[PDB]
């Protein structure tokens, strides 16, 4: 196997980690196991502390000459690497003990737990006026040595590592989407009806969506245009429940539904990132440093027990809109989830 290793700029403090992406399977989250290596001669009664923090950041300390570098914490955890604290959790992980055997007695394990009420890694797409980075929530593992928690906050003696919290597609298929709306004209018995549905509830990234619309235009009014689109909803609730909705994919057809007739068609629409580069504020999957990530996966939750997650929540919906002459517009919205398949 392999492990990830990063060292302090001083070159004396090194933290070992087994993974970078930690899975959230709605009942547990993979614990952040690892060991930290430090020479006690450099310590000289100093203490090594490791902190796991998830924050609502905008920008970073990358010597970029620009302000408004916001930073809002979401959860803070601390751990005293050296000297060792009481044992619990009693058994060090197999990776932890293997690393301790490999490195000797100068490495010390550190353990963390990710509570269920924490958000995943989401990055909002930067705009032209933003440089370096943009808004987003991300996880961080930081190892530093100091007498207290605020004694040696200088950056030249600490090592910081970036990790991710991810979710994959549940193996249990959901209900088949469907939505019907009837446009009643409150003058006569004349009415307009339309039905929309999807073949599945969960779609992979890049997998096309097949939506079929059935329109029974039993009216004198004529349908002039049919619009099918996919929208992304980003809930940014931190202290006020702000929301941001943006169309990620659109398809249009000049399908004129004749008066007093019926219409049926199947539309294929696939959301991707090539045509959504310019859309500022678009939610993307959490990046490590700067690499390209796809459209943000929908943040699924457990069956109930909502606890007001303070991060960014992203969901997807398909909207079918029918353009009709002289008013009487009608539209249908049906939601779906977007996830990666679980790795083999």
């Amino acid at each position, epitope marked *: 196997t392999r492990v990830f290793k990063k060292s302090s700029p001083n070159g004396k403090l090194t933290v070992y980690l087994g993974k970078r992406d930690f899975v959230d399977h709605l009942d547990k989250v993979d614990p952040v196991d690892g060991v930290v290596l430090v020479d006690p001669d450099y310590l000289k009664d100093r203490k090594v502390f490791v902190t796991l923090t998830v924050a609502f950041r905008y920008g970073r300390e990358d010597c970029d000459v620009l302000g408004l570098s916001f930073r809002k914490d979401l959860f803070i955890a601390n751990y005293q690497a050296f000297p060792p604290t009481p044992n619990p959790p009693r058994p060090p992980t197999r990776l932890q003990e293997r690393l301790l055997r490999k490195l000797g007695q100068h490495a010390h394990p550190f353990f963390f737990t990710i509570p269920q009420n924490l958000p995943s890694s989401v990055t909002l797409q930067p705009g032209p006026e933003d440089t370096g980075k943009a808004l987003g929530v991300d996880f961080e593992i930081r190892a530093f040595v100091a007498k207290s928690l605020e004694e040696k906050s200088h950056k030249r003696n600490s090592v910081r590592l970036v990790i991710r919290k991810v979710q994959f597609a549940p193996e249990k298929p959901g209900p088949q989407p469907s939505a019907e709306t009837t446009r009643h004209f409150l003058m006569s018995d004349r009415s307009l009806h339309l039905e929309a549905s999807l073949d599945k509830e969960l779609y*992979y*990234h*890049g*997998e*096309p969506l097949n939506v079929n619309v059935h329109v029974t235009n039993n009216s004198t009014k004529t349908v002039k245009k049919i619009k099918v689109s996919v929208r992304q909803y980003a809930d940014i609730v931190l202290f006020s429940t702000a929301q941001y909705k943006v169309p990620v994919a659109q398809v249009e057809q000049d399908d004129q539904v004749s008066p007093s007739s019926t219409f049926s068609k199947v539309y294929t629409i*696939t959301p*991707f*990132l*090539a*045509n959504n*580069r310019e859309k500022r504020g678009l939610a993307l999957d959490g990046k490590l440093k700067h690499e*390209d990530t*796809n459209l943000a996966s929908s943040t699924i939750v457990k069956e109930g027990a909502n606890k007001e997650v303070l991060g960014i929540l992203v969901s997807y919906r398909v909207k079918v809109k029918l353009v009709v002459s002289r008013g009487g517009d009608v539209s249908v919205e049906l939601p779906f989830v977007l996830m*990666h398949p679980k*790795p083999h």
Partner: antibody
Amino acid sequence: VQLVESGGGLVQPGGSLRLSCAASGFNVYSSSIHWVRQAPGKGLEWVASISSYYGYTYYADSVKGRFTISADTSKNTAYLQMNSLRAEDTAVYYCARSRQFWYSGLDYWGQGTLVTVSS
Amino acid sequence: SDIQMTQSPSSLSASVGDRVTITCRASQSVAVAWYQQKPGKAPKLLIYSASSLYSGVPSRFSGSRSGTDFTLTISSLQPEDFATYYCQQYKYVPVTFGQGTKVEI
């Protein structure tokens, strides 16, 4: 799942030739298309790649500017437009496929089409 | 710079039932895949990530990692396993291929 190459034959040096890789059984946005040529008396070699999801396109330094690869996402097809063909461009051209997300090698290959350059 | 991927030997001969191995060393650390090509046929993927066996490949094929050196091993060489084998990396663009290794009777 299948991949079919078309557009072989012989082209005079300095000419041009376009080959179409007709994809089937997979989506063009959930997979990436690569062209790998194998000159006779020589192993494999990567030529060009396209990522329809990110809208990116990559070329080897020996075909930079000379060759152009594009994909028609409507019918799940990719093309490789070769220009300024030289005598070293003769090879059997395979259009391969890899998963767009976290590619794990070129699992699917075409039957291969022969391209020859001579005077 | 571009990764110089070298595999050895250029050719090897072994009767049916023997055990053979092919090594592969990169210029720098890299995400390694192995492909088998029969003469007159398109290559067929065998191993990805240098250890993960592709679906449908017989279990005799094996892959291992040791630093920068990568090895492809066949535990029991079947009578149809004689072909040319290639070594590929996909950590950086461009992706480089090995020179091949012809396994003969």
